[PDB]
Amino acid sequence: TQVDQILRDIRAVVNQMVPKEAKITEIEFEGPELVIYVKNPEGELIKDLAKVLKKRISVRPDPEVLLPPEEAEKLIFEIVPKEAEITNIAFDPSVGEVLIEAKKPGLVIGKNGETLRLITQKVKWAPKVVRTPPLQSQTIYSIRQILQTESKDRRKFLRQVGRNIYRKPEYKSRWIRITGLGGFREVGRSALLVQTDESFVLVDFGVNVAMLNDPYKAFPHFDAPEFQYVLREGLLDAIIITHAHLDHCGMLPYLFRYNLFDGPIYTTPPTRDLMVLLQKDFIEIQQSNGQDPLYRPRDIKEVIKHTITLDYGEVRDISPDIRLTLHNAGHILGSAIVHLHIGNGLHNIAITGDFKFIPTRLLEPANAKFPRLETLVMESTYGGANDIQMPREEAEKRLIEVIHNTIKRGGKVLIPAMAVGRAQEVMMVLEEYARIGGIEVPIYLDGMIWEATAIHTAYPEYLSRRLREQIFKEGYNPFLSEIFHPVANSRERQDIIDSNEPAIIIASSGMLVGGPSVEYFKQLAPDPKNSIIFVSYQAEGTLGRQVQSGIREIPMVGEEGRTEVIKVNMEVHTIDGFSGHADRRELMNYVAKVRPRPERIITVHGEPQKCLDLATSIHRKFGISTRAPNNLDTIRLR
Ligand SMILES: [Zn+2]
Ligand SMILES: [Zn+2]
Numbered sequence: 081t082q083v084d085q086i087l088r089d090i091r092a093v094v095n096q097m098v099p100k101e102a103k104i105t106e107i108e109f110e111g112p113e114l115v116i117y118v119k120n121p122e123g124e125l126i127k128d129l130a131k132v133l134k135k136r137i138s139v140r141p142d143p144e145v146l147l148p149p150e151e152a153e154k155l156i157f158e159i160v161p162k163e164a165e166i167t168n169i170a171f172d173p174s175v176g177e178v179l180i181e182a183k184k185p186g187l188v189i190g191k192n193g194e195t196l197r198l199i200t201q202k203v204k205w206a207p208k209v210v211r212t213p214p215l216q217s218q219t220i221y222s223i224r225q226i227l228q229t230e231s232k233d234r235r236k237f238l239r240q241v242g243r244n245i246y247r248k249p250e251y252k253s254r255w256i257r258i259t260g261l262g263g264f265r266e267v268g269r270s271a272l273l274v275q276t277d278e279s280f281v282l283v284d285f286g287v288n289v290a291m292l293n294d295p296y297k298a299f300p301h302f303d304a305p306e307f308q309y310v311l312r313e314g315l316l317d318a319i320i321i322t323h324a325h326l327d328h329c330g331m332l333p334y335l336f337r338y339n340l341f342d343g344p345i346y347t348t349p350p351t352r353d354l355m356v357l358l359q360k361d362f363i364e365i366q367q368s369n370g371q372d373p374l375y376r377p378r379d380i381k382e383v384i385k386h387t388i389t390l391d392y393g394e395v396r397d398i399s400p401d402i403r404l405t406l407h408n409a410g411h412i413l414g415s416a417i418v419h420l421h422i423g424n425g426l427h428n429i430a431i432t433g434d435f436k437f438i439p440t441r442l443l444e445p446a447n448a449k450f451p452r453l454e455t456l457v458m459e460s461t462y463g464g465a466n467d468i469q470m471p472r473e474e475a476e477k478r479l480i481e482v483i484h485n486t487i488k489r490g491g492k493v494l495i496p497a498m499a500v501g502r503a504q505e506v507m508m509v510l511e512e513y514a515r516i517g518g519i520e521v522p523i524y525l526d527g528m529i530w531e532a533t534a535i536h537t538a539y540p541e542y543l544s545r546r547l548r549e550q551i552f553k554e555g556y557n558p559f560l561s562e563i564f565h566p567v568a569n570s571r572e573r574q575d576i577i578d579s580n581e582p583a584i585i586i587a588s589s590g591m592l593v594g595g596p597s598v599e600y601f602k603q604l605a606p607d608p609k610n611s612i613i614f615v616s617y618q619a620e621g622t623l624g625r626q627v628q629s630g631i632r633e634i635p636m637v638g639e640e641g642r643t644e645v646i647k648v649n650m651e652v653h654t655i656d657g658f659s660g661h662a663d664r665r666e667l668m669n670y671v672a673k674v675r676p677r678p679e680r681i682i683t684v685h686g687e688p689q690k691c692l693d694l695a696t697s698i699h700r701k702f703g704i705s706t707r708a709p710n711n712l713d714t715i716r717l718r
């Protein structure tokens with residue numbers, strides 16, 4: 081590592097373009113950027129010295145000239161209008177920045193950007209105002225508490241990452257290869273290893289909850305020689321998470337449990353929070369089932385401490401020959417398409433993760449415009465030629481149809497859905513339907529769906545333009561609808577089931593693998609008055625896919641090794657018009673619209689035949705080279 085020889089040349093030109101009166105106390109790399117500390121604020125020299133050094137710079141005051149938290153926290157409630165209504169105020173010393181939250185962020189941000197600098201001087205801390213979210217999230221609060229109490233660790237973490245990213249100047253890769261450790265010709269445990277002769281980055285690291293009883297099918301291949309080498313030698317530069325779902329980020333905290341990695345995890349803020357929530361959710365579902373969890377809160381916590389967030393469009397160097405950029409995937413809040421600029425730029429890779437290419441209630445179609453692009457890795461969940469989804473609006477009509485029939489017949493509607501994803505989407509469908517007077521019976525929300533929902537309201541900028549304004553700007557907010565009733569605990573859950581009142585029940589998780597939805601299913605499945613509606617992809621080996629297949633008698637190993645058979649009499653429906661996955665038509669259209677036209681396309685994340693079908697179809701229609709690799713396949717990209 082010749083990092084300090086690089087830092088030496090920087091400290092030379094910086095101490096040549098910076099006011100020597102401006103007592104520079106330090107210059108070092110912290111995360112994906114150069115930071116210059118100075119005890120003397122003050123502009124437009126950053127814009128320069130930055131484009132001169134060809135690096136991302138950030139000037140700040142020495143952490144010493146910063147008024148303590150418990151102190152400057154009262155000086156602020158003094159220097160800002162009481163009408164500004166400051167709901168919360170947090171600190172993040174790892175960046176010397178004060179996060180100020182208020183219902184009326186205008187009177188706190190300075191009626192002329194003034195009060196912003198007004199308080200900035202009185203405490204030296206970097207102010208950042210945030211409009212109070214309409215719903216408070218335990219997850220968000222928890223992450224905030226961790227970031228201000230772990231300041232010591234993170235500041236050290238950011239120095240290590242920085243010295244690592246710039247272990248050498250911009251390098252042109254000699255070779256590039258991608259290895260599927262999981263998620264090739266199957267849905268589950270997505271894990272792809274990007275390799276160059278200088279770097280190693282992991283894109284996604286999921287688990288296959290549908291196959292939890294089989295460690296050989298549930299986890300990415302830890303037995304891959306190249307991967308054991310990368311971990312054991314400490315060569316993994318980074319991990320990039322496309323989105324919050326467990327089959328894309330679920331094994332991430334396992335890596336910390338066993339101290340196999342302590343580098344950076346790059347992802348969008350919404351993803352960092354949703355991920356943390358689904359991971360906590362996961363290990364709790366396991367314990368509530370009497371199983372030993374894959375990891376513990378202490379590991380999920382380590383994940384948070386090792387995560388560096390980027391918003392879409394932010395280009396960042398994550399190693400000597402790899403620059404990252406995230407783009408909207410339109411799958412779920414915060415979902416991204418990973419774009420890796422590698423070496424010379426003549427062999428760039430775009431990794432789709434899961435994506436949607438038409439608008440939905442919460443999101444806009446995936447980005448299809450990139451700078452330079454040679455290889456496109458895309459999902460195939462609906463890759464079969466006949467995998468056309470039901471039109472958005474016909475699905476809505478079908479849903480309403482079914483709810484009416486069931487609610488009349490004196491029954492209940494069970495809609496299994498993941499905490500994040502279809503839950504929110506379906507909620508919007510029922511909410512807009514409520515506003516015209518269609519919701520008579522109550523709508524219960526079980527399985528952390530409400531907490532996830534809270535996270536959405538805190539990231540309006542990651543929602544579609546339509547819903548963005550409708551949220552933060554207006555006082556009215558769709559999720560806040562009085563039609564949704566969060567299930568408080570196991571007693572109420574049981575009350576709900578025993579009660580004779582018809583109702584709509586939306587509960588995690590989406591494939592009946594675990595969580596409240598399995599309880600509802602089991603106790604409601606016998607009565608033919610009830611209805612269960614699948615609105616998401618049912619993976620192979622899930623109870624959900626069994627029910628969906630029509631199997632009317634399902635065995636379930638219960639407590640004390642005794643198996644129990646649930647008799648299925650309730651109505652089984654499938655409405656795929658709410659899917660977060662691009663359907664066959666969308667996938668093919670995506671390839672058509674993507675620009676620049678990729679020289680190669682690799683199909684993944686889909687049942688075997690679907691991956692091949694899509695790959696064959698893309699080649700036949702667009703004449704582009706394609707391939708549906710197997711796990712453990714490695715493709716050299718030249
Ligand atoms: Zn997903
Ligand atoms: Zn997925």
Ligand SMILES: [Zn+2]
Binds near residue numbers: 426427454679718
């Ligand atoms: Zn080429």
Ligand SMILES: [Zn+2]
Binds near residue numbers: 566567568572
């Ligand atoms: Zn209640």
